[PDB]
Amino acid sequence: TFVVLDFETTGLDPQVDEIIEIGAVKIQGGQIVDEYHTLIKPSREISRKSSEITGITQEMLENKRSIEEVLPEFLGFLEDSIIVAHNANFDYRFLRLWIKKVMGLDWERPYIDTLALAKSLLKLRSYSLDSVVEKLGLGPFRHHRALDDARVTAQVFLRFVEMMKKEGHHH
Amino acid sequence: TFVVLDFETTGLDPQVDEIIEIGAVKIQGGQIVDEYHTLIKPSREISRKSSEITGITQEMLENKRSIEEVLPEFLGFLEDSIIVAHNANFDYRFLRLWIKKVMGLDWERPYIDTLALAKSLLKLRSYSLDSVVEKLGLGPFRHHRALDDARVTAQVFLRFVEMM
Known part of the structure; x- marks a missing residue:
């Protein structure tokens, strides 16, 4: 079983900044089998620049849980699972850092990086999600x-x- | 045990319109125990005005099962359950009408309408799911x-x- 992951983030630095959106799909049998999505309220409120890039404003997050409460819930959504993300290196960094920082745990799980895989299989010039999507004719x-x-x-x-x-x- | 449901249809006319999408969540002890979702291929193809409103295309519907297939499965997913829906009249009537049609059953079941609940509980200018969701902060x-x-x-x- 695999969990395909995509985060939204407070900025590019996985030490200091925070996961404000998580979305996920669970696959088995080559089949999507269920789903996870939440918004996450950051302890540091979100800069003008952040909202500008993400589309996510303070108001959307204002009433939402914390990673302290969301992380254990997301973890229970995996445990067994091979992680899959586009350019997984980045989301993955953010993930294991935040398991440390709040849950104490030292955490590691094997991942499949669609970006890197697509470089093995495709011949393309940008390897964006949008380029491999059109290239595959999906x-x-x-x-x-x-x-x-x-x-x-x-x-x-x-x-x-x-x-x-x-x-x-x-x- | 509850089943909260939302349909997509080809239109509002009980005499001719079809259910082309079913979405359902099953709830027990304040928690989601199970989920149901399918597209359903209609006997009579979807119009462009229907495509624009629902997002569902003729192409998306080619390979899909028909009502005659899906209803019993879905009636299996229901069973026991109290049904919950927003603006419950349309969607319930439609269910009933179509169980009557494809299956010959006269079929009833209790149901809660979250639009009636919002009415007791809230006082808004609108009672669309969008205005109620905004209000409750969800x-x-x-x-x-x-x-x-x-x-x-x-x-x-x-x-x-x-x-x-």
């Missing part, structure tokens, strides 16, 4: 689906039921 | 670019390790 993707909406309406439900467990919620 | 609504890039990378991965 595609039309549809990322927003009925399921993503089911997932938010489900948080909506969940949230309502916590709200109605307090006596006199109707006032 | 946004940002449908930003998941990192999952998107991971799903794209997964597919490059799958392709290579089936290649060269």
Whole structure:
């Protein structure tokens, strides 16, 4: 089993700066089998430059968990898994640093770097995700689906039921 | 045990429109135990106006199963469950109508509408899922670019390790 990973980050320095977005897909049987996505609130709030590059603003993160609470949850999403990322070296650096920094752990896991693999198989001039995607003729993707909406309406439900467990919620 | 669901359809007319997508999450003890999702090939092809609104293309639907296949499987995924949906009337009626059609069953099941709940609980100018999500602070609504890039990378991965 493999977990294909993509992070959003507070900047290029994996010592000092923080993971503000994690997305992931679990594969087995050559099949996507489930999914992980969260936003992560940074203890240092996000600079004008960061939002500018990422598209991610302080407001989107303002109400979200910390890596202290998200990391253990993401780890439970792997454990067994070979990591896979485009240019995995970077996300991976950020990953093991932050397992150290907050979880104490010394952590290592083998990864497959689609960037490096694509250099072995392709003959291309840029090895971007966009270039190998067109080069492979893969595609039309549809990322927003009925399921993503089911997932938010489900948080909506969940949230309502916590709200109605307090006596006199109707006032 | 709950199943929160969202459909895509070819249109709003109960007399002729079809369910071309099903999305469902199954919830027990305040947690997600399972997920269901398929596209469904319609007898009567999707219009361009439908393609534009739903994002679903004729090409995406060529290889897919038909309602006659999918409903029973999906009715298997349901079973017992209370159904939860936003603006529940349309989507529920549609389910019912189509179980009646392909399967001859007269079928009922209790259901919660999160749009009715928002109404007791919130007081907004709109009760669309988008306005309710903003209010309860559960946004940002449908930003998941990192999952998107991971799903794209997964597919490059799958392709290579089936290649060269």
